[PDB]
Amino acid sequence: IVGGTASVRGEWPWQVTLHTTSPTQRHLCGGSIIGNQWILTAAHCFYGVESPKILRVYSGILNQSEIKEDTSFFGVQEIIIHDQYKMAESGYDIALLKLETTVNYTDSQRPISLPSKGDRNVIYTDCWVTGWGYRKLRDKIQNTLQKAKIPLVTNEECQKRYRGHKITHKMICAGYREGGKDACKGDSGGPLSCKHNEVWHLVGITSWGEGCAQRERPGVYTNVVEYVDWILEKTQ
Numbered sequence: 754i755v756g757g758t759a760s761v762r763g764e765w766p767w768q769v770t771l772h773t774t775s776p777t778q779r780h781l782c783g784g785s786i787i788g789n790q791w792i793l794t795a796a797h798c799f800y801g802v803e804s805p806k807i808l809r810v811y812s813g814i815l816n817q818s819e820i821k822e823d824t825s826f827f828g829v830q831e832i833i834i835h836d837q838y839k840m841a842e843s844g845y846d847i848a849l850l851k852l853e854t855t856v857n858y859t860d861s862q863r864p865i866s867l868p869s870k871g872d873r874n875v876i877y878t879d880c881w882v883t884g885w886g887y888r889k890l891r892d893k894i895q896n897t898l899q900k901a902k903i904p905l906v907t908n909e910e911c912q913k914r915y916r917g918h919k920i921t922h923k924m925i926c927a928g929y930r931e932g933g934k935d936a937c938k939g940d941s942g943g944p945l946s947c948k949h950n951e952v953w954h955l956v957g958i959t960s961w962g963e964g965c966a967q968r969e970r971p972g973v974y975t976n977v978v979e980y981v982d983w984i985l986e987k988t989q
């Protein structure tokens with residue numbers, strides 16, 4: 754996260770850190786708890802992943818330094834990538850992880866609601882991007898989960914900034930015209946979380962952008978509302 758600040762314990766209890774353990778253990782991507790057995794993340798995260806055997810899902814984590822060899826994690830029983838996914842910038846950047854067993858929810862590990870039926874024309878004005886990613890294009894993974902408030906941009910404005918890509922209704926853009934706050938490397942797969950009527954909804958999945966926090970180049974997110982039917986079919 755560029756231009757962000759540190760979170761405190763319990764603040765974003767649906768945020769997970771997905772680790773790979775091949776060839777060594779490291780944070781790979783963010784994700785969001787959406788059910789006792791289900792995480793929603795980005796398909797691009799699995800580009801170099803040979804199988805679900807090497808993944809570990811950690812929940813309830815504020816600082817990466819909390820994870821040690823005896824820290825409990827959930828195994829992944831299945832990775833479900835959207836069948837039309839090709840590359841992040843052309844869309845369909847969405848995946849479900851089915852866990853081996855059910856998370857009992859606690860104060861530190863809680864679900865976020867999907868965008869609700871009836872809310873298709875809500876204007877979200879309180880949206881946040883969170884993650885352990887870089888603070889600038891060449892940087893490092895941060896220890897403490899970071900947060901930044903970012904405004905949504907219309908698809909019309911977003912397309913004018915990205916005339917070499919197809920910005921469709923299945924994407925949502927967010928960013929300031931002057932730049933300065935945005936996702937960056939290591940935040941993909943995590944949530945763009947928007948609060949409406951004091952309930953959090955998973956509006957976007959962090960996906961791609963030109964640079965990080967550059968002027969007139971908003972971040973691009975998978976528009977989760979457009980995938981609700983796909984999610985319900987896969988989870989049932």
Ligand SMILES: Cc1nc(N)ccc1-c1cnn([C@H](CC2CC2)c2ccc(-c3c(-n4cnnn4)ccc(Cl)c3F)c[n+]2[O-])c1
Pocket residue numbers: 779780781782797798799800886890894935936937938939940941959960961962963964965966971972973974
């Ligand atoms: C370096 C590293 N170290 C780790 N230990 C773990 C993971 C990584 C690493 C390197 N790239 N990525 C991902 C893709 C990859 C998982 C498949 C990525 C690509 C793009 C963006 C992005 C940008 N960016 C444009 N230019 N940079 N960022 C701007 C706006 C938005 Cl909205 C964005 F989503 C964010 N991420 O995370 C992760």
